[PDB]
């Protein structure tokens, strides 16, 4: 009966662990220390942005390194022009509770979602000149916490239903569903080639999925608590993630292994947002305290201790060209750092 | 021209500080509890207005389980309404530990919890038709005249255990009571006034 159905489970679990240990060897600490480290760097804010009304939850950069989109609990989306610090559009959301927002690669559409269980698509280049609802994505029994535009017509959304979904804007019907997650999933990142995307759930497990094949390829379980953020390395063969247990972990897709960790004894709060630089040398991770700490992706050294937010940071992002990094906290303040 | 863009930004800012002045008096509230609790007796919204101020109620029920990941969005709510079935006994336990998962939950240690137990009439009709055995009714609370004290001791025990599990600091305080009404809105108004008055002293260093 069912008695024969679990034996091979831990049999292949032990196979995975043994294969990983065999392919593993002496760590990269003795290799990365050869080169001179970047050291501590002083980074100052440039645009002390104001105008927001409530707690900021998520943000995203456009293809150009100038335009931004921000979401907040007040049910309003504001498009910011970073260079001149002025609002381009103001979208009044029907649902006040939103937790994610995204910018289309073409810059024509903006998506947002939250506790309303519906993903809202807004068109910015309409002929009428006023931003309006383009399409509402139904069929979600859990709160949506992360959405990213695969292209101008395909979107991928992470829900609170222990699954992720892919939607087409033209038809509005679900294309494929990824139900391999056994815990609440909130972090979702996409590779630069738009071929693979990772997702980390509350079960301290991050797994890789396929756009069209539609099942998990590799699974990583090095974390200890809920995964809050995940992001892809610029190269695309690796990714880094953060958790509520106050440590950042880097994983390699080809190695299918844990690849060193970022943590310190001086911080207890967990990580909220994770993002890399253009070259990936510097890893920028948020924290629940009042100071944001960035790490060396190859040395785990405290590169920056930049602060300036009266509340915890909830969102972070780096421009495509790597010119600047924008961070947002719960004090309705956005900061641009060069 | 940048002048027209600045004018548009100023107009958008003026519009932003026109709906936000209508949102600082909303006095939002969060309602959660067991399925069998009388949620409809008192995301779903309800509209009611008492004494020149409106109220905004959040009946979240579209989330699966654990309630601990989306609750961080409610960090800036004035008060939380917690409702359990008093007439029920078998499911009172994990309902009590449900309250533990809210009282001690992080990002939630600054908001008061208003207990709104119902089914007092059901409990009375059931009584009429282990720690409970050893107990006495505190003399501080005076029951209303003409009230059958067979259920009064049980109600006092429930209040005492609720206060005990609540007190297990002063920045946020539980208000345990019973109810079975037209004065529900009045009671909610008084409770909100009390919690706001307490919160004002926290900034005045008084």
């Amino acid at each position, epitope marked *: 009966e069912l008695d024969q159905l679990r034996q091979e489970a831990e049999q292949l679990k032990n196979q995975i662990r043994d294969a990983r240990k065999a392919c593993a060897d002496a760590t990269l600490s003795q290799i990365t220390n050869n080169i001179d480290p970047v050291g501590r760097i002083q980074m100052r804010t440039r645009r002390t942005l104001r105008g927001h009304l409530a707690k900021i939850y998520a943000m995203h950069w456009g293809t150009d390194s100038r335009l931004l989109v921000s979401a907040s609990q007040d049910g309003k989306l504001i498009i910011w*022009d970073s260079y001149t610090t002025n609002k*381009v559009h103001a979208i009044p959301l029907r649902s006040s509770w939103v937790m994610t927002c995204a910018y289309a690669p073409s810059g024509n559409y903006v998506a947002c979602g939250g506790l309303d269980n519906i993903c809202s698509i807004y068109n910015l280049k309409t*002929r*009428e*000149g*006023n931003v309006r609802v383009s399409r509402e994505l139904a069929g979600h029994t859990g709160y949506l916490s992360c959405c990213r535009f695969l292209d101008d017509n395909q979107i991928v959304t992470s829900s609170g239903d222990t699954t992720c979904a892919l939607w087409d804007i033209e038809t509005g019907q679900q294309t494929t569903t990824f139900t391999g997650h056994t815990g609440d999933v909130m972090s979702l990142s996409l590779a630069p080639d738009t071929r693979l995307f990772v997702s980390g759930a509350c079960d301290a497990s991050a797994k890789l999925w396929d756009v069209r094949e539609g099942m998990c390829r590799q699974t990583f379980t090095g974390h200890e608590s809920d995964i809050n953020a995940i992001c892809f390395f610029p190269n695309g063969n690796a990714f880094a993630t953060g958790s509520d247990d106050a440590t950042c972990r880097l994983f390699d897709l080809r190695a299918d292994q844990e690849l060193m960790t970022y943590s310190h004894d001086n911080i207890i709060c967990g990580i909220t947002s994770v993002s890399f630089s253009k070259s990936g040398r510097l890893l920028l991770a948020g924290y629940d305290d009042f100071n944001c700490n960035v790490w060396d992706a190859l040395k785990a050294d405290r590169a920056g201790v930049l602060a300036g937010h009266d509340n915890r940071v909830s969102c972070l992002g780096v421009t495509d060209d790597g010119m600047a990094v924008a961070t947002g906290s719960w004090d309705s303040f956005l900061k641009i750092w060069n | 021209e940048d*002048k027209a*863009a600045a*004018e548009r930004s100023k107009m958008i800012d003026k519009n932003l500080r026109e709906d936000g002045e209508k949102a600082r008096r909303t006095l939002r509230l969060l309602l959660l509890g067991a399925d069998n609790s009388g949620k409809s007796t008192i995301i779903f919204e309800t509209k009611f207005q008492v004494d020149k101020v409106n109220f905004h109620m959040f009946d979240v029920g579209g989330q699966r389980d654990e309630r601990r990941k989306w609750i961080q969005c409610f960090n800036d709510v004035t008060a939380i309404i917690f409702v359990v079935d008093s007439s029920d006994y078998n499911r009172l336990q994990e309902a009590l530990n449900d309250f533990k998962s809210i009282w001690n939950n992080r990002w939630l240690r600054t908001i008061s919890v208003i207990l709104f137990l119902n089914k007092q009439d059901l409990l009375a009709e059931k009584v009429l038709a282990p720690e409970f055995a050893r107990y006495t009714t505190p003399e501080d609370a005076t029951p209303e005249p003409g009230e059958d004290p067979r259920v009064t001791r049980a109600k006092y025990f429930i209040r005492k255990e609720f206060v005990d599990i609540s007190t297990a600091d002063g920045r946020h305080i539980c208000y345990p009571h019973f109810t079975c009404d037209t004065e529900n809105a009045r009671r909610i108004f008084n409770d909100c006034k009390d919690i706001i008055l307490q919160m004002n002293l926290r900034e005045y260093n008084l």
Partner: single-chain antibody, 232 residues
């Protein structure tokens, strides 16, 4: 999205009248409005402007202190008042809706217009050509020269190209060099170095016959170039 003009007709010199235009299909409140005058057999010329919310208003030096403009958001109709009329005042009057932000397309739509008959030291640009005999089938290129460079230090220029079909309302093709507007084919392109600006067309169609107008938007005293017409 359409604009309808009213009023007009025959007015005695020195008379007063009010011009009203009706807008539908788009948000008038968020859109600024411009008035542009087209003298018969001559080029276009800007007249007046009103900003969103009526917070900023400009007038041309020719009609400064003489004409007034107003807008009514609830009934989405634009008001223009005429005080004194002369021989040079009569012309073709058009209403233009524009929005100013990053990635916007100012002067995208042009009104039908209404017919009116009667009984310095600013920027300016000229184009040497006025009309060239070219057949459809091959590329057509034109050049324009500006007295003062339009390359703002912000990063982009402010040259606008317009299309006027014979007997039809004007339309916009290129609002800035190297970025195409909506509703036009990809055969239209423009380039410039701040002094000499040129427009190149891949192929010439029958519907592309019209008058070419060049526009600057660096200084608000808008001045339009002399019309260049293409015929087959």
């Amino acid at each position: 999205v359409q604009l309808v003009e009213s009023g007009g007709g025959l007015v005695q010199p020195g008379g007063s009248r009010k011009l009203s235009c009706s807008a539908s299909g788009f948000a008038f409140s968020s859109f600024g409005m411009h008035w542009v005058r087209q003298a018969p057999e001559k080029g276009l010329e800007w007249v007046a402007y009103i900003s969103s919310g009526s917070g900023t208003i400009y007038y041309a030096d020719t009609v400064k202190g003489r004409f007034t403009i107003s807008r009514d958001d609830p009934k989405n109709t634009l008001f223009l008042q005429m005080t004194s009329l002369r021989s040079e005042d009569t012309a073709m009057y058009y209403c233009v809706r524009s929005i100013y932000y990053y990635g916007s397309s100012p002067f995208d739509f042009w009104g039908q217009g209404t017919t009116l008959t009667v009984s310095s030291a600013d920027i300016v640009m000229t184009q040497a050509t006025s009309s060239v005999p070219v057949t459809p089938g091959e590329s057509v290129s034109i050049s324009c020269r500006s007295s003062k460079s339009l390359l703002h230090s912000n990063g982009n220029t402010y040259l606008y190209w317009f299309l006027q079909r014979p007997g039809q309302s004007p339309q916009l093709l290129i609002y800035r060099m190297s970025n195409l507007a909506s509703g036009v084919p990809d055969r239209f392109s423009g380039s410039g170095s701040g002094t000499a600006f040129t427009l190149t067309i891949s192929r010439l169609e029958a519907e592309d016959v019209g008058v070419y107008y060049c526009m600057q938007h660096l200084e608000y005293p808008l001045t339009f170039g002399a019309g260049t017409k293409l015929e087959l």
